[PDB]
Amino acid sequence: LSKATLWAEPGSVISRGNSVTIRCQGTLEAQEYRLVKEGSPEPWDTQNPLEPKNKARFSIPSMTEHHAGRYRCYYYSPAGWSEPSDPLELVVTGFYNKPTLSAVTLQCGSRLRFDRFILTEEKLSWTLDSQLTPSGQFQALFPVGPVTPSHRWMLRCYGSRRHILQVWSEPSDLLEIPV
């Protein structure tokens, strides 16, 4: 069975008020494309595209809290509905105060409450549940691995809250390891 392919440009982690483009790829026989968003019962968006019908473009001029989430794309053709695409997890950042990130074990922490911390390479990511210390810091501890002049890290970290997992804080300041 055939499935749509769904991705975001320039990427799936977007600062609030910045632009992002969601693209879906089907086949030349596709008649309609539909985005469905987790938690939204009715279709998020629909397009009946012209010309080459194997692509759809779903544009977000300015990323808000309400765009953040998990999406699937389907296309319709004479064969009926495609299998859904793999889910695209679209994250918005800038909605809480930036945590601090320091030192190899890295510590992402904040006084401001968070349920999760996400460590990101400026390209990969690492998610951990937070922990509050008896002195009232929310933190997570991230091991890094090989620190070497050949592989230097450009890292920032974010906090999130359990009720909206795709809504992240402002990023921490960039931390470069080793020196």
What are 154's strand-pairing partners?
Answer: 176
Check if the beta carbon of residue 112 is closer than 8 Å to that of residue 33: no
Please name which of 154, 160, 156 lies closest in space to residue 171, comparing C-alpha atoms.
156
Residues in Cβ contact with 3 at an 8 Å cutoff, skipping those fewer than 6 apart? 82, 83, 84, 85, 86
Cα–Cα distance list, 118 to 51, 95, 159 (Å): 41, 14, 6
Residue ranges per structural domain of the chain? 1-93, 94-179
With CA atoms as reference, report the closest residue to 26 among 87, 86, 73. Answer: 73
Same fold, 1-93 and 94-179: yes
Domain topology for 94-179: Immunoglobulin-like (2.60.40)
Q: Which two tokens stand for residue 88?
A: 């695209």
Resolution (A): 1.9
Q: Which long-range contacts (CB under 8 A, 24 or more apart) does 145-153 make?
A: 147/104, 147/177, 147/178, 148/178, 149/178, 152/176, 152/177, 152/178, 153/121, 153/177
- Under a CB-based contact definition with an 8 Å cutoff, are residues 68 and 23 in contact? no
CB 23 within 8 A of CB 58: yes
Q: Which experiment gave this structure?
A: X-ray
Phi, psi (rounded to 5 degrees) for 109: -150, 160
Query: Which residue is it, tokens 């009946």?
Result: 48
- Hey, what long-range contacts does 18-22 have (CB within 8 A, 24 or more apart)? 18/62, 18/63, 19/59, 19/60, 19/61, 19/62, 19/63, 20/60, 20/63, 20/67, 20/90, 21/57, 21/58, 21/59, 21/60, 22/57, 22/58, 22/59, 22/60, 22/71, 22/88, 22/90
How far is 29 from 90, CA to CA, in rounded Å? Answer: 28
CA distance 175 to 114: 20
CA distance 57 to 74: 13
**153 sits in which H/E element:** strand 153-161
**Angstrom distance (rounded) from CA 86 to CA 72:** 6
CATH entry, 1-93, from 2.60.40.10, 1.10.10.10, 3.60.150.10, 3.30.70.1450: 2.60.40.10
Measured from the Cβ of residue 37, the count of other Cβ atoms closer than 10 Å reads 20
